[PDB]
């Protein structure tokens, strides 16, 4: 609104109040801010629950999930018959892109999800574009032919590597399974069940 | 490609002229018309105008010319076939010259 001349006022005091609030010294912190936030965890003393909370983050991250979707899946499985500690494991492992990554035609789980969303993926009684449909234990997932028309081929090899609860034949692009993953195939990265009781408190 | 070109033999499949054979002299793509010689002969009442060196005479009586015809009413005429018939055409691409060529679907005749 005039010749404010920030030099004139800033130097005018050299400490005061406004200069120090504003002090051009103000650095960038353009990486400190982001990274530390990122994601944290640890266990504490006063609430105990710290262990449970951290495990949820790991579990949710292992599959690339937003917390809201997880609450829906827990609500679904919660009501049924009884001690369902065998059901929700099948539900959490029934993701199509999870099966596609565990099927072995993608280098990483998120890449498989991207593929699924990009329309690589052919199902049985249906087809698939959304990478979140909950699949049934005994279902087939025939891979497209256009994907093989784009030979990056490197994938097929991973497929054979596999893990015992999935049966897939390389090159021929076909897959199914039975005897749903036991806890051995769900390694000690996240193997606990008191986060489960926690979700009954947070989710009715 | 185009169904009708300038030059190919054509007939009329609807209207007063049925089996009306002629040669297409010119094609208007925008108005979907086609001038075919010998068909749709109209005789404009020719006035007399004298305002130019050529208009000093401009001898015009009962000149009968050609009226344009909708391209839908036209149908390609077969010539290679022993029994000429009216049919539809394809747009096959032969790898011999990589050029698009029209071929009938009730026979195997090119163009």
């Amino acid at each position: 609104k005039y010749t404010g001349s920030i030099f004139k006022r800033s130097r005018r005091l050299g400490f005061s109040l406004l200069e120090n609030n504003k002090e051009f010294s103000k650095g960038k912190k353009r990486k400190t801010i982001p990274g530390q936030h990122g994601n944290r965890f640890r266990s504490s003393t006063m609430s105990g629950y710290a262990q449970q909370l951290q495990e949820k983050q790991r579990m949710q991250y292992m599959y690339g999930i937003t917390d809201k979707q997880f609450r829906r899946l827990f609500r679904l499985v919660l009501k049924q018959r009884g001690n369902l500690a065998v059901n929700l494991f099948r539900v959490l492992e029934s993701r199509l892109d999870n099966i596609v990554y565990r099927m072995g035609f993608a280098p990483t789980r998120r890449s498989a999800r991207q593929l699924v969303n990009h329309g690589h993926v052919l199902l049985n009684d249906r087809t698939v574009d959304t990478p979140s449909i909950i699949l049934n234990p005994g279902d087939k997932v025939r891979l497209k032919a256009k994907t093989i028309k784009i030979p990056i081929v490197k994938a097929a090899s991973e497929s054979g590597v596999v893990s015992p609860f999935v049966e897939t034949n390389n090159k021929t692009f076909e897959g199914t399974y039975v005897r749903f993953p036991e806890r051995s195939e769900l390694p000690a990265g996240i193997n606990e069940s008191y986060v489960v009781e926690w979700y009954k408190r947070l989710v009715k | 490609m185009q169904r009708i070109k300038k030059g190919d033999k054509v007939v009329v499949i609807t209207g007063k002229n049925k089996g009306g054979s002629g040669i297409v002299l010119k094609i208007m793509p925008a108005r979907q018309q086609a001038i075919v010689e010998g068909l749709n002969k109209v005789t404009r009442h020719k006035k007399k105008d004298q305002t130019t060196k050529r208009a000093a005479k401009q001898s015009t009586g009962k000149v009968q010319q050609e009226a344009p015809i909708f391209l839908s009413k036209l149908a390609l005429f077969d010539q290679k076939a022993k029994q000429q018939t009216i049919g539809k055409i394809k747009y096959v691409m032969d790898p011999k010259t990589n050029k698009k060529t029209r071929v009938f679907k009730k026979s195997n005749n090119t163009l």
């Binding site: 006022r9 130097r11 005018r12 005091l13 005061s16 109040l17 | -």
Partner: protein
């Protein structure tokens, strides 16, 4: 304008309430009082400032 040069705090507009709560708009003005200071080699330059900044100036040793 009627404003301080050190800070940017200016007038405060409000109501002039009287008996019977009759409303009339009024203006509170800041205490612009001349003041001389020593900055950049002690260069004195008269600056119209609010009494609050003057008290702030007095305690901060600048005013000497």
């Amino acid at each position: 304008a009627k404003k301080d040069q050190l800070t940017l705090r200016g007038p405060l507009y409000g109501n002039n309430r009287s008996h019977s709560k009759t409303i009339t708009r009024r203006k509170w003005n800041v205490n612009l009082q001349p003041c001389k200071v020593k900055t950049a080699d002690g260069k004195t330059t008269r600056i119209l400032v609010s009494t609050r900044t003057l008290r702030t100036l007095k305690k901060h040793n600048r005013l000497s």
